[PDB]
Ligand binder design. Structure first.
Ligand SMILES: Cc1cc2nc3c(=O)[nH]c(=O)nc-3n(C[C@H](O)[C@H](O)[C@H](O)COP(=O)(O)OP(=O)(O)OC[C@H]3O[C@@H](n4cnc5c(N)ncnc54)[C@H](O)[C@@H]3O)c2cc1C
Ligand SMILES: Cc1cc2nc3c(=O)[nH]c(=O)nc-3n(C[C@H](O)[C@H](O)[C@H](O)COP(=O)(O)OP(=O)(O)OC[C@H]3O[C@@H](n4cnc5c(N)ncnc54)[C@H](O)[C@@H]3O)c2cc1C
Ligand SMILES: *[C@@H]1O[C@H](CO)[C@@H](O[C@@H]2O[C@H](CO)[C@@H](O)[C@H](O)[C@H]2NC(C)=O)[C@H](O)[C@H]1NC(C)=O
Ligand SMILES: *[C@@H]1O[C@H](CO)[C@@H](O[C@@H]2O[C@H](CO)[C@@H](O)[C@H](O)[C@H]2NC(C)=O)[C@H](O)[C@H]1NC(C)=O
Lengths: 459, 462
């Protein structure tokens, strides 16, 4: 059968690969951008390539092998380092000058961890129907016996680092049942390894794709005509007999099936018109799940003024304004001598920030850094890079997040095809939504679902 | 039967009243503070009594009579004014000065409203168990077809105005099914009347209390020994045989039943120890519901620099930072010539703000005001009042908000009695949680459940 795959991100390439492996090779991969990889995408910043999107292989060293790890660590040997968050207590900056007492912070972290652990126990007891699910915030109130969760600046930044920095939305909107504990870590291990390779984390996608798409023997570039870049799908027309897909450049294509890999955000946006309209159950499932945004703001300085050394990689800024430029990273290992800092924000801050100029953001950041390093002569960042994923119509966000209110059945409706319209992507990952490995496995499962239906008529 | 009622806010006074009415007069109302009224409470600010807490009779002029209205507007004749929000479109300030074009704003309002109305239709269809509920935000995304709800400064303050300003938590945390549409408005009417009377909205509570508790003929002060103020209940021991209640000043009382009217926030804070501990199902119901915080920041100025006149009472600041000092009210009618402004914040901002000095807050607000009225010489507020309800142990917030995640059954468990321990309060209002009328009605309802057990020996609840 001919299958059109919309999008050449991890899941699209992964799905096409799986299809090809089932022998469905009459594929047409339509990618909106001029490159493949989607959310795994590097860029030159300050003479170095940094990841605008995914940057870690998360869930390593556990009881099950994270499928991406071997590709990263062995097959491609992409340069990488395990992140050590053990020294956070030594790196929590007071809103107005210097770090807090490490012991004080370590206890706050401990309480936080302890609470989450109790949340994990509780989570295990909830009913599969999700009927007793609650937001993580609700669990925190319950375990701490307070009418609120973390509310002091230190508690909040700890909270933000523990949750928002992972999920990109606050605990209060987050489904406890579906995030605590998280399969990714529960299955693959608690370690996470930061990929810092000039080839880019995206090399993983390119590798997969080269396993079945044609590439130039010298160039190495993919030249397979089954991959068409700069093809923005804008319409997918389907019937019991097949589908037609129209691209922004006005090309029109036909196939027996279409595998949609565009992000949940893209699906929530109307960039693609389905005709007929997706059924209500589908639409509701789509709109009920969350497409989070996680913005990696890179900054380059004329000189270092922050600490480097053991436990220095990650540091938090305990602003009284929850989530305000709170999580920082310095790359003494990754990009030795670059004088680059990375501050991450999400959700509301991400949308506010994407909406203002880089200069304005730089200026806000300079004020924070100055407040952070009052003793130093903090030079103004020479360059800043503000990824605008939510604003990018081909992503409209960085990764899904599971909100309280959505249960599994409904999450699964996300994965459900509609007639000949199949879906794949991290937000369709049965247990790894939000990750590269989730996009990866999702391409596989989605393809297998189409394969059984299409090849064995077992739908 | 002797009944101890914990708390003399609206629900406790209302409950005790209903009990008294069913002939249960062997009552003891233990009030933590030196006064009754709880969340209905005024205070002198810069020479005028403004309300720290409830300020409106919400839901007026509808198909059904808000029980609170007649007392306020007729029995007591408390001074009050219908809030008119029809001119908001002319009153939305730009983060960086002046107001937005009215037509532009009106359109955004109309969109917001239309999404909401579409949400009301969806809501009607949701399974009554609450099992298909979703957040208001989800409904917004669905209807706007965006991966986010309002996200520009203007749509956001409009959204905040429409929701956070009513519920004190964001749409994304709020149960659609339980708040859109809102019964208070559907049943009692869309209007709201702001009480601006030196006697305070709490007069309603003093009035009811007075219907059954003894008062001094000249002072009119309640002098009934059944009301004991400054009695903070710290422990409630209950058994098949009865209940014992202990106050912080070591007083110990015994009764057949106890009726707890303390806020959800108090319940979530362990101020009162129950012995035996409440059942897990109860505990969970308690923690899952939300106790919101709504902070009425009053500011006093040496002179007026904002507009007054038609449609001027309410104005919004379209901050690019959602919920940042966004909803303003000027008191040309309520406190004429006082030069007071009220900016309302809730939730995260409330918590942040309660935790820092009023001076710091005032300075934040001054910068906002100067950005809003760059053409004026905005004088620094000479006075500011930041109500700290979340920090107050007898309240731990302002009012409950039904969050996405609490289902019908869970909410009922929140209300359910445990043995001889009954619960009441706005957070136990079946359809009016979060309101004065909900507290009022909840008092009567819990009283009735208690009356059936006590008088009709009908003790099984749901
Ligand atoms: C900032 C950020 C941080 C993250 N952190 C990490 C991390 O450290 N570790 C981790 O494991 N995961 C992380 N993730 C999550 C991970 O990157 C994603 O889950 C994964 O790459 C999603 O791949 P996917 O194929 O589902 O979607 P995508 O990568 O979005 O692929 C979808 C593709 O469809 C294309 N497309 C969209 N619309 C159209 C259209 N109309 N027509 C045609 N093509 C279209 C897009 O251009 C894209 O190439 C991060 C992501 C981001 C963005
Ligand atoms: C800032 C704010 C704004 C609001 N806006 C409005 C509005 O405009 N309109 C509206 O309808 N509603 C509004 N509400 C909600 C309304 O005021 C409340 O719903 C209602 O007053 C609550 O009454 P209650 O009896 O349920 O609780 P409360 O008024 O809290 O009564 C509980 C009583 O118990 C006391 N107590 C607590 N702990 C103990 C203890 N351990 N022992 C003894 N006594 C104890 C408390 O002191 C209090 O007196 C607002 C409330 C606040 C605070
Ligand atoms: C990631 O890959 C490196 C690459 O080899 C691993 O380090 C090697 O592990 C083998 C296994 O016994 C040793 O014999 C080699 O001497 C090691 N090489 C180096 C350079 O140390 C490493 O353990 C891998 N990490 C994970 C998490 O799998
Ligand atoms: C609030 O109360 C006032 C007090 O009566 C109401 O105004 C009275 O309404 C009757 C009804 O027609 C008139 O005959 C009186 O002349 C009115 N009095 C005044 C002073 O105008 C008023 O309508 C009430 N408002 C609401 C919303 O109930």
């Amino acid at each position: 059968p001919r299958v059109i795959v919309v999008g050449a991100g991890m899941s699209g390439i992964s799905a096409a690969k799986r299809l090809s492996e089932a022998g469905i090779t009459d594929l047409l991969i339509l990618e909106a951008t001029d490159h493949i990889g989607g959310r795994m995408h590097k860029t030159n910043f300050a003479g170095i390539n940094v990841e605008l999107g995914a940057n870690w292989v998360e869930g390593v060293n556990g009881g099950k092998m994270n499928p991406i790890w071997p590709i990263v660590n062995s097959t491609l040997k992409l340069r990488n380092f395990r992140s050590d968050f053990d020294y956070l207590a030594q790196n929590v900056y007071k809103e107005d000058g210097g770090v807090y007492d490490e012991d004080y912070v370590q206890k706050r972290i401990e309480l936080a961890d302890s609470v989450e652990e109790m949340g994990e126990k509780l989570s295990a007891t909830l009913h599969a129907s999700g009927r007793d699910d609650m937001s993580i915030l609700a669990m925190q109130r319950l375990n701490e016996h307070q009418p609120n969760g973390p509310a002091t600046p230190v508690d909040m930044v700890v909270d933000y680092y523990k949750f928002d920095y992972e999920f990109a939305e606050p605990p209060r909107v987050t489904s406890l049942q579906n995030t605590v504990p998280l399969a990714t870590f529960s299955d693959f291990g608690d370690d996470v390894y930061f990929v810092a390779d000039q080839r880019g984390y995206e090399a993983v996608v390119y590798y997969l794709a080269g396993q079945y798409l044609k590439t130039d023997d010298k160039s190495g570039k993919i030249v397979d005509p089954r991959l068409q870049l700069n093809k923005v799908v804008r319409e997918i027309k389907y019937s019991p007999g097949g589908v037609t897909v129209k691209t922004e450049d006005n090309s029109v294509y036909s196939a027996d099936y279409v595998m949609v890999s565009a992000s949940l955000g893209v699906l929530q946006s109307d960039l693609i018109q389905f005709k007929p309209k997706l059924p209500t159950w589908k639409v509701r499932a789509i709109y009920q799940f969350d497409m989070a945004v996680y913005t990696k703001i890179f900054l380059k300085f004329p000189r270092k003024f922050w600490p480097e050394g053991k436990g220095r990689e990650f540091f938090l800024y305990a602003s009284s304004r929850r989530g305000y430029y709170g999580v920082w990273q310095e790359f003494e290992k990754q990009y030795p001598d670059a004088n680059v800092l990375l501050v991450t924000v999400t959700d509301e801050e991400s949308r506010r920030i994407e909406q203002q100029s880089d200069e304005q953001t730089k200026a806000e950041i300079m004020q924070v850094l100055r407040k952070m390093f009052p003793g130093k002569d903090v030079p103004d960042a020479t360059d800043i890079l503000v990824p605008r994923w939510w604003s990018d119509r081909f992503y409209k966000g960085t990764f899904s997040n599971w909100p309280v209110g959505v249960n599994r059945y409904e999450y699964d409706q996300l994965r459900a095809p509609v007639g000949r319209v199949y879906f794949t992507g991290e937000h369709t990952s049965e247990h790894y939504n939000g990750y590269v490995h989730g996009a990866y496995l999702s391409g596989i499962d989605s393809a297998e679902i189409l394969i059984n239906c299409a090849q064995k008529k077992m739908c």
